[PDB]
């Protein structure tokens, strides 16, 4: 036990070995994989990119006649489980409508901000991975109608959900696009003192370079934007947060 216990950490910290002599230490290493460990301090990204490209270059030569153009493009490459087109669409949610089928119908076939925003099971709050609110909101139930405008042109596409507000049926959610990589889930409140509804912008960044979770929630002045909304509902002053609590 004395001889053998704790026998690995020594190689990483040759300063805490008798002579700073590596020949004392135990280094785990694969006999076969020892044929390719020859260049020291080669950067991690240099090796990995160097293997991947070594792959891409071969596949391209063997299966695309060395023509890069032939490669199929996508919005973003990720978040596709290994289990397995009309513009002005409408969808009527019942109590019995399937969850998956409903979300596949919302997303559409083409890989675009919609596809991510309705199928990404997660989103990124800072570094944290919080469950997707857009899959929570468009969980199907009685009343809600989902209209899609410019549905075959992503950039212009705007999904509107509408629900029964006091017997009559009004729009609740307007998920649309701001500037290229900004998704505004404009959540509307109609039941107000003056009848003039209050629009909450739940902004989200859309990064296609993160194939896994391309949807991140905007948190800078996100409190301020919920404050501005609750300053319209509750307060009847002009909005100002620069007042001392004391």
């Amino acid at each position: 036990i004395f001889f053998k216990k704790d026998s690995l950490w020594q190689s990483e910290h040759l300063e805490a070995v008798v002579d700073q002599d590596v020949q004392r230490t135990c280094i785990l290493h694969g006999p076969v994989a020892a044929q390719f460990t020859k260049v020291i301090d080669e950067p991690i990204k240099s090796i990995m990119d160097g293997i991947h490209d070594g792959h891409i270059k071969k596949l391209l030569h063997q299966y695309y006649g060395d023509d890069e153009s032939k490669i199929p493009a996508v919005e973003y490459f990720g978040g596709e489980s290994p289990v397995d087109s009309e513009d002005s669409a409408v969808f009527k949610a019942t109590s019995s409508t399937d969850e998956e089928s409903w979300f596949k119908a919302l997303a559409g076939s083409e890989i675009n901000w919609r596809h991510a925003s309705f199928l990404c099971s997660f989103i990124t709050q800072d570094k944290m991975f919080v469950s997707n609110p857009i899959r929570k909101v468009f969980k199907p139930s009685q009343g809600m109608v989902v209209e899609i405008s410019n549905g075959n042109t992503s950039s212009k596409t705007v999904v509107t959900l509408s629900e029964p507000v006091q017997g009559e049926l009004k729009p609740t959610v307007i998920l649309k696009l701001l500037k290229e990589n900004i998704i505004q889930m404009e959540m509307i409140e109609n039941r107000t003192m003056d009848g003039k509804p209050v629009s909450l912008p739940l902004l989200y960044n859309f990064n296609p370079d993160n194939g896994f979770a391309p949807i991140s929630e905007v948190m800078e002045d996100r409190n301020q934007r919920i404050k501005e909304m609750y300053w319209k509902l509750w307060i009847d002053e002009p909005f100002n947060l620069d007042f001392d609590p004391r």
């Binding site: 994989a33 044929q35 390719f36 020291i40 950067p43 919005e75 490459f77 290994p82 289990v83 979770a213």
Partner: protein, 830 residues
Amino acid sequence: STRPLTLSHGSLEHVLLVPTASFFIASQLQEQFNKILPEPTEGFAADDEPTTPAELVGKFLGYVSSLVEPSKVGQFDQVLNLCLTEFENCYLEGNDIHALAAKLLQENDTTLVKTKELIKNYITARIMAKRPFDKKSNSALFRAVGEGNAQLVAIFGGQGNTDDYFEELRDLYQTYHVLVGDLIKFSAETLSELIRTTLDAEKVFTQGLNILEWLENPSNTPDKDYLLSIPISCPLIGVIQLAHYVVTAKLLGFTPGELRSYLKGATGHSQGLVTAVAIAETDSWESFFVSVRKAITVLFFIGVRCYEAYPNTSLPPSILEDSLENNEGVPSPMLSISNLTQEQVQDYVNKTNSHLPAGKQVEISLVNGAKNLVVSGPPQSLYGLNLTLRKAKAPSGLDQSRIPFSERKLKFSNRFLPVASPFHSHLLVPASDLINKDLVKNNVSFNAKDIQIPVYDTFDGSDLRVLSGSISERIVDCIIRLPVKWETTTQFKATHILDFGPGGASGLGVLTHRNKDGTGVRVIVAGTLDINPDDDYGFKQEIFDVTSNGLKKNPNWLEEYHPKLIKNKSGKIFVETKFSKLIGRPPLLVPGMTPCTVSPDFVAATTNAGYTIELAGGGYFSAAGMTAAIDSVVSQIEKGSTFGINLIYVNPFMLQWGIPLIKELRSKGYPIQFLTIGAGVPSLEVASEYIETLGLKYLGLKPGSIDAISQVINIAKAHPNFPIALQWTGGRGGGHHSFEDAHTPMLQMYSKIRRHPNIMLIFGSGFGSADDTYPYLTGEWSTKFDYPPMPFDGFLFGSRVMIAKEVKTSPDAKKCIAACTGVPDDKWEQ
């Protein structure tokens, strides 16, 4: 104007709206069938009683059809036509009876005997009703063939598939009497004619060859030792195959020429090859029996002449005792060696032939697969070989898992075939010339122009038609003495195969399926109606199925797992595999390594290098010390990056805080994408807990040997929609390594893994470049082993990465790792 008429078997009933015109005779046959039908029992377990309303109606149809005479137009006929059409449009939803029968077996608590009793009833009822299958069936399979989306080849099984083979002929007679009972009696009288025709046939047929007598009355049926005797068995298997062909042609509603035209080629195993060429030449229903008489004749002669040259002899009762008392077969003139290569067996038979004289030397008869040979000779000499083979084999209940792969004792099986003649051995050579004098006697010769579809020779694999010499001479030469090179002859490109021969699911169909698993080609056993639980080969129903369940294609690995490329909006090129699709990063990962991937700075760097790495838990002791590590990763990485955690299974103390910690971080939502379990595979309950509680994306497992891989497969099956990275590594891996070879366990499991779409099969161990990994992405790495290509979804690098910039290994260690020369994959086990 139709009055209701109800018929019941206890709780279950059916109703037919009988026209008030034909109500009296219907209501008369109603009480008649109700007094024939026995009392309802609990569970309906007993025989001769329906379990379902389809089976009840079927029995009614059968009972009615029995009272119907097809010559005389009776008052039973109009009600028969009314109740038959009622069954059809109530139960046969366009689909064939065989598909319905298959759904009854799959869904209901109906036995297979009940199903065969339903189907014979329906067919009987269909024939007496004066309603043949003149209409060309809408069977999905043949529809796809006609449209050119498929290609068929018909194979024909030979001797030694099964011992109890006569019970197939019985089953065909009993079930499809009304379809094949004309062929059976025609064959019967043809054999009877050939007995007293031939000078010395009556000698060998001691207990006669009145096949119709034994079929009609099972009591009269001789012992199986007489039935396996080749002069009887040969032509009778011939008749079994032809009867399976006719059944096929009739149910489809084609002529024997029309079905032959649908096929792109046909071949047989040994004496099935003769049926193939007889089926190759058939054209109409009328000129069918000219081809049959040819097939019967040739099969009768080869069976008589072979038996006369070398008959089975008295065997010493000591040898029979010794083979029985070691869980080995009764000696016979063929022995099947499974899980040994052709070269090994050739060496051992060369050793045997050394001592033995020329007259008793044994030679390899069939090469069924790469690792499945059959040696033929004298059963005493084949015992003398079986003794040599029993030395080398280790006990089946021996654990060699802890022994290095190449120092293990090679384990195989060796069982005697159920056959009564040394086919494809020098012992049957004298018969050759005698058969040709008998073949020319009956003028039973095949012309090249008469054959329309190609038939493949069993020895060289070439087409029969192209032979400039006598086709009858060559096909005799093939069956009696020339060895079968089965994988030479079966190298045709075809989308489907039809097994007609004997054996059902033990015969030739399943052997070909195993011998070209994963090349896409589907095998359908056309012999018997049954349910395959894995659905890795079809039964009769899939021929006659009219829904999309007919044209089921077997996965082709090369094309289904073809590594692709894709580009992002930014225009970065990813390798597109199963793995990469999920993670949305290149399909490489650096696996959890203690102490190299314990450093938060390394994990962070590699994550920020656009690759997937696992935080090694092995360097961490407390929930706190790990939590502080992770929060040092999270600080460094980019927003919406992720990294995995590599917990060892064998360290219980590590798991008891490690698992709950991850559960807390994931319930709070830290960027922990996945968990790897290194050194061990968890139990089904513990693995289920990790999946359904820790709320990961996927779960990595590192199986050490075959038993582990199996256990992984079980866990994936238990959670079909949850993705499961299988991180396979050999014994050649760095760190804690098993004794397993890198390659062989994947040859032996690639099939069984890929049948579960949620397993993301990652090859690892001995990788540091693209050149050495390319053939395992392409799949070609399996071609060296004589398999179809087997592409892998991803790759892990363990050793290669340890001389990186960001790994905290001390510079003089890095120098020492570099200075290691290393050895190729063949040497490492030193």
